[PDB]
């Protein structure tokens, strides 16, 4: 690790600076270095890690979608042969995306998840594990595609089971997990009905628990609830 010689606290400080500078590749590298110090992550540190890699892989996914769209058009009946270049470059971006996903999954497996005992950490990491297998699933086409999908499903399911036992229905981690698992059902698992049911039930159970919250907790929970509603509006 090229960050092995830097202090943990300095890595966290520089991740925050990288965020302010919108340098998310740097942010992710700094947070990878911090994870590799071997200590558990605090709540803020977990979110720094997630924000960094979500931004990096989000950009890769957007680029992949553009290139995949161009590639599909090049393969329509009537197109002029473009040669191998569109496929090659889509494959290049795809391989870089898979590499980032494998890196994050590696951090979760070595050894963030196994040391995470509190619900807020364990559900958060298992959600990430489902998310990064979901991104692998988005580009998967080979002998392993069903297994990648099932790895995402299994991680999300363990996270769901813990969240329903250990967190209130308005907990923003629980809500964000349900939001993303619902998208998994709709976009990956070809289960739109499950996606819609999960989003609606999550929204309604949260609604009924808002009365217990402070003004600031209310703002956090209703923000994610609105994303659930947004998706439901998209899908119905």
């Amino acid at each position: 690790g090229a960050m092995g010689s830097m202090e943990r606290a300095s890595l966290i400080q520089k991740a925050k600076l990288a965020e302010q500078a919108e340098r998310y590749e740097d942010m992710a590298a700094f947070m990878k270095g911090a994870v590799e110090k071997g200590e558990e992550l605090s709540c803020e540190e977990r979110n720094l890690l997630s924000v960094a890699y979500k931004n990096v892989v989000g950009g890769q996914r957007a680029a992949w979608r553009v290139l995949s769209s161009i590639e599909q058009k090049s393969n329509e009946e009537g197109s002029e042969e473009k040669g191998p270049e569109v496929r090659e470059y889509r494959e290049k971006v795809e391989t870089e995306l898979q590499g980032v996903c494998d890196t994050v999954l590696g951090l979760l497996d070595s050894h963030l998840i196994k040391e995470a005992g509190d619900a807020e950490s364990r559900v958060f990491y298992l959600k990430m594990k489902g998310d990064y297998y979901r991104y692998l699933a988005e580009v998967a086409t080979g002998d392993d595609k069903k297994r990648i999908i099932d790895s995402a499903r299994s991680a999300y399911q363990e996270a769901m089971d813990i969240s329903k036992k250990e967190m209130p229905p308005t907990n923003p981690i629980r809500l964000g997990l349900a939001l993303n698992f619902s998208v998994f059902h709709y976009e990956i698992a070809n289960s739109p009905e499950e996606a819609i049911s999960l989003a609606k039930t999550t929204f309604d159970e949260a609604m009924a628990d808002l009365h217990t919250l402070s003004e600031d907790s209310y703002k956090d929970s209703t923000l994610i609830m609105q994303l659930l509603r947004d998706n439901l509006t998209l899908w119905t």
Binding site: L179, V183, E187, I224, L234
Partner: peptide
């Protein structure tokens, strides 16, 4: 695309 967080 749908919203995720």
């Amino acid at each position: 695309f749908p919203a995720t967080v």
